[PDB]
Amino acid sequence: LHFIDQHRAALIARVTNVEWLLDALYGKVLTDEQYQAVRAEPTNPSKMRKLFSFTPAWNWTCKDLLLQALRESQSYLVEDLER
Amino acid sequence: LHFIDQHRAALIARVTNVEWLLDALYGKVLTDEQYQAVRAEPTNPSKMRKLFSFTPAWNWTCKDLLLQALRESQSYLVEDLER
Amino acid sequence: LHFIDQHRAALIARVTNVEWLLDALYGKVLTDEQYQAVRAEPTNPSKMRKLFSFTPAWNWTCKDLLLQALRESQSYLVEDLER
Amino acid sequence: LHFIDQHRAALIARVTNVEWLLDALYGKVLTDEQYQAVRAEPTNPSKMRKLFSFTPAWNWTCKDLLLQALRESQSYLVEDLER
Amino acid sequence: LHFIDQHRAALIARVTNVEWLLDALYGKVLTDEQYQAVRAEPTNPSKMRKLFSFTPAWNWTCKDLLLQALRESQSYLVEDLER
């Protein structure tokens, strides 16, 4: 949801497990070509920026799915960002 | 159809997967030169604007093909735009 | 042959072993510069699109060579595409 | 079959014996270069992701072979995923 | 503020972390299209010049935000430029 737009820079600079999120979002929110495009970036911030480049086309449901995956993978990061 | 005409600005500013649409429209609606010209644009909004630059010569069938390609690629974007 | 033009989008989106095709087509259909240009692409669809960008100059024989390389590499993909 | 596409994330995150599956799929579905490429990944999830990167070129028969190999190797994993 | 105007050439030729500044300015001073336009430049000086091309529309507050982001990112560069 609006959480990923409000904390865009922090999520880009602090998310460390991107492959799990990519697997969670594969097929339903991300196409296979976008999946490879994100996986081709050298560093984690580069992968996060490539993933965020696809967000303008997303609706509320896709952002909700991403935030749910974030809670499942990094609960502590989401808790820190909310606090 | 008229959908891509009434939502021109939103489609320009929110479509993120342009290469798939170009491949879908290649040969049937876009010539090779137009395909290369669209592919040569720097950013996604520039690519999508270059794509609409060819729309005045399209009939209802070409617009329907583009709408079908958008539905297959980004169902959520089309659902959000309709809503 | 006409097969690679009829199934251009599917070949772009589904070919997974591009290096073998590049080695097969090197020297006789592809120059060294075009070879390096194709290998420079990040993802498999990007490599396939770069390879297809050289197809306008190809005659029937070059397309036949590409189809033969595809049959040797991915027999199952060609069989699925034909049916 | 469609089983490996329905449970892609779970199969990536839970398959522990990848070398046996690579032996089962060698030659028939996997080329030697793809064999080496998958075998060179550091971790089991990395190996599974690299193997799944070749799935877009597969037809139903190759996926059936992979599912049969999974049933022979990890019957319990397949039963758990089905349940 | 006037700091980036009196040190335009030095900032163009010496700023090395442009993505961090872009992330800091995203959503408040730079639009998404401008973000992609700056991000698409080949070299760091090109990115800096593209970013500076948008400065005529900026007020004092936007320039202050850019200066504060620079101070967060490169304290040493700002200290050297002031000295």
Place this chain on the structure above:
Amino acid sequence: LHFIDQHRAALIARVTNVEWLLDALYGKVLTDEQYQAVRAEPTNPSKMRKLFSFTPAWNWTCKDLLLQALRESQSYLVEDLER
């Protein structure tokens, strides 16, 4: 409204996001030919002058629409000009 006529020179010399304004005014205030004519103009001040060349045929409503688009795109410029 009269705002764009009071600050014509400043708007010409300081507006940096012209494509967004063109998309906002497309169809409603700007014809397709006028859109291409503005878009083919090389530099941003020159594009703004080309766009302003169509203002003599505008009523209060079109000027208000342009002002609203400017407020949505670059607010800081708007309060800078008002102040």
Place this chain on the structure above:
Amino acid sequence: LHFIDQHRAALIARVTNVEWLLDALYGKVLTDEQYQAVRAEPTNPSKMRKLFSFTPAWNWTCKDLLLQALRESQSYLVEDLER
């Protein structure tokens, strides 16, 4: 020779490796400024049209040199054109 004048449209629409031809013609037929002007075009047909714009000043020898470069680069394209 007369070959490039007879097949001007096909050469414009089908030549894919313009950089090699430019390097072959550099210094002897093309000046540095013309070389840079041709290299600055977006797409291959645009590059070919820009190069052909210099042909009115060429004699038979320059056209023969261009034909020899084409034969060395893409023999199959020449054979297709003659056939």
Place this chain on the structure above:
Amino acid sequence: LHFIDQHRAALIARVTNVEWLLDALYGKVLTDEQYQAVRAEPTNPSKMRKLFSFTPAWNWTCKDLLLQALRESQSYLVEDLER
């Protein structure tokens, strides 16, 4: 806590009991995939660098857990770093 950030280089170059720390942090701070990724490094400094690569996503509690595990495992190293 801030201890592991203050002594990052010393901890990377001096920690010799990494598998025990991985066991301590498994499940609650480290995912299974991250555990495998850390265990795949050849040398102890490489393992420590891979482990520290995940610290940007950690909050204060995770760093406290890591410090407590370090105190349990190698108290002499911690007291030496304090002095």
Place this chain on the structure above:
Amino acid sequence: LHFIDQHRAALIARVTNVEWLLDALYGKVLTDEQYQAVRAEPTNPSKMRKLFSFTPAWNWTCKDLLLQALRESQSYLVEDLER
């Protein structure tokens, strides 16, 4: 000084670092609009001709500044022209 008027054609045909000179001359002798106009040219000779298009309004001091910038950027060209 008179150096750039004596070697106008050679400077047009041989200067390859135009952006550095533009940055050096920005604000002091070049306005923003002229800066964008010069950067909008396709090739280096075209950019340098656009730069000389503004020289009739320059006095000795501006030409001296341009010569000093040229000496700082590309000295070897300066001694080559003087010799």
Place this chain on the structure above:
Amino acid sequence: LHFIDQHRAALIARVTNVEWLLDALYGKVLTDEQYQAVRAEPTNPSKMRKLFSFTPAWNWTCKDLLLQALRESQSYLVEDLER
């Protein structure tokens, strides 16, 4: 200091333990994103070139820190370069 600018090529071609220097410069001279970007390069010369890619933003103090790290790591290399 000026030492790393005087011996840039030799330092690029002869430094063998880039990781130790990166750990020494982490945080105070290098950000985390730049740290990952440097560690993502294939070979030691590539890593060291990526490291010098950030040097234009450095002041004298950062270069002094790098020289001190080099002295601590490879005293023989520094002694040979000075001699």
Place this chain on the structure above:
Amino acid sequence: LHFIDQHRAALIARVTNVEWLLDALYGKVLTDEQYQAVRAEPTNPSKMRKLFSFTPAWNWTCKDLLLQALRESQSYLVEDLER
């Protein structure tokens, strides 16, 4: 010297170690911006063409330096070209 001018096409198409030449020419013949611009090209021929684009400003000394660097790096290539 004139060697790189009479063998321009062969040097563009056959030079394989470009980074070493860039390091050799950095700081005395090439500026930092030109260095980054050359390093940003995808393939070796593209890098060589970008490097040659700066040659019009070079005098005999810079070309001699480039030839000396080529002899130090690839003696066999220079020997083959001379023969």
Place this chain on the structure above:
Amino acid sequence: LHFIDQHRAALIARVTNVEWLLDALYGKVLTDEQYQAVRAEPTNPSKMRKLFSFTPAWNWTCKDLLLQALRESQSYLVEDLER
């Protein structure tokens, strides 16, 4: 010699001992940076392709040395390729 160009694909796909060839070609034909770049590839075909990427700069003597090394290491492979 011409043997390594006639059997490029077979040599890429069938050579299994690459470190021995790299050591044989080290210093004489391969620089240290090229040695590291080739050695950093994941799989044997990748290493062979990276090594072949440097072939365009080689003369007949370098290819003769490579063929001699291949004969010394894999006599059976060379004998099979001859027939």
